[model samples]
Target: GDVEKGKKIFVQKCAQCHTVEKGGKHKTGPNLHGLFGRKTGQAPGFTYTDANKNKGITWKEETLMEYLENPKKYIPGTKMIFAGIKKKTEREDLIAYLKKATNE
Candidate 1:
C-alpha cells in the first residue's frame, strides 16, 4: 500500500470522526494533528473517556498500529467506534501515511 492509498483509507474509514490537520477542530474524535508524540486522550479541547485519559499512553508507531488494529483492545473502555483494520499491510500503510501527514 502507498501513501495515497493509505490516505484514502483514512478518509474513508476515519475522516468522519478525526481530522489530521494542525489545530483542526474535533469531530466525534479528536484532531490527529501532531499525534505522533502526544499522549493518549490529551488532544486539546476534546474530552476523553477515563480509560484513555488515565492510560498514560504515548503515541508512537507501534502503539498507533496496535490501537488502529484494535481500539477496544488497546483501550478497553475507549469511545472510538470503528471496527479494527483487518489487514496488516493496510495498517502499515495507514501508519506510514499518518507519520508523514501528521509530522507536517
Candidate 2:
C-alpha cells in the first residue's frame, strides 16, 4: 500500500493506456481522475465497450481489487487488455496510490 511504489507500478504498467491526474486526457484507456466516485465507462470522450458501459459497479478498494485481479473475468468485454495484477500487495499498493492520485 505504498503510493510511491504504486506509482512506479503504474508508470511501468498502466500509464500506457491510462492517466491519473485531474483533467488528464484519455489515451488507449480512459483518464482515471475521480474514478472512485464514478461508474465504469464514463470518462468523457472515451469510447467504451458495451460491457463496460453496462457494468453497474462503482470504483472503490474492494471493487478495484476484484477488477484488477481479473478484468476480463470481471467485465468480460472490456477493451483493457491488461493482464491483471496477481500480487495482492501490488494490487493494494496500486489502489492506495489511485485513491489519493485520482482525487487531486
Candidate 3:
C-alpha cells in the first residue's frame, strides 16, 4: 500500500521532529516508534496532556488514523503541532508506513 513512499515521506516530513524506534528519546514530540497498540500519552518519560492522560485513549489503527487525519479535531488540547499532511494519498501512504513501522 505504498508503504515505501510513506516511509520516504515520513523521513522527509516527520523524522526531523520524531523517532520511530522503540525506546527513542523525546524530541519536539514523543517517540512514535511503536505507537500502534500503545496508549495515548503513554510513551515513557514523555509528558502527556491532561486530556490525553485522562481520556485513556488507545492507539489502535482506527484511532491513530483519525488522529493523523486531524490532530486538533481528534484531541482538542493535544501537544502535537503538526499542521498535518493534506494530500489524501500522502496521508494514506504515511499511515501505511506508520503501520509498517509501528507493526499495525
Candidate 4:
C-alpha cells in the first residue's frame, strides 16, 4: 500500500462526503483531522448516533481496516454511508494516506 495510491483512492472514493485535512470544515461527513488514535464519532462539529459514539474504539491501522471494510457492519447504526473499501490493500493504502493527511 502506497500513500500516493491512497491519496488517489481518497479523491475517488471518500472525498465526496469527507474532508481529510486539518482545519477543514465538515462535509456531508465529518472532517477527519487528527484521525489516528481518535475515538469514534467524536469529531467536534459532527453529529453522531450513540451507536457510533458508544462503540468505544480508537482509530488505528487494525481498527480502521475492520471498520472501513464495512462500517455499518462494524458499528451497526453508524451514519457513515459510503461503500466501504472492499480490498485489503486498498484499505491499507487509505490508512497510509490518512496517516499522512490527518495525522499531521
| Top candidate when judged by lDDT against the true structure | 1
| Model 2 TM-score, 2 decimals | 0.87
lDDT for each residue of candidate 2 in 1-104, tens digit (9 for 90 to 100)? 88989878886788778766555567677777766777765555765888888786778788788888888888887888976675688888898889878666
Candidate 3 per-residue C-alpha lDDT over 1-104 given as tens digits, one digit per residue, 9 for 90 to 100: 48999888877877777767555557776667676666666555666776666657667777777778887888888777875786688768887888878863
Candidate 3: segments with Cα more than 4 A from true spot: 21-24
| Clashing residue pairs for model 1 | none
Give lDDT per model, in order: 0.78, 0.78, 0.74, 0.76
What does candidate 3 score in Cα RMSD to the true structure? 2.2
For 1-104, candidate 4 gives per-residue lDDT tens digits of 89999988887888777766555557667767766777775656665778887877777778788778888888887778855576588887888998877656
Which order, best to worst by lDDT? 1, 2, 4, 3
TM-score quality measure for candidate 3? 0.82
Give the C-alpha lDDT of model 4. Answer: 0.76
Give candidate 1's TM-score. 0.86
Per-residue error (Å), model 4, residue 84 = 3.7
State every prediction's TM-score relative to the real structure: 0.86, 0.87, 0.82, 0.84
Specify the poorest-scoring 10-residue window by lDDT in model 1.
38-47
Q: How high is the lDDT of residue 39 in model 1?
A: 71
Cα lDDT tens digits, model 1, 22-95, are: 56568678777766777775555676788888777778988888888898998888889966685687898788
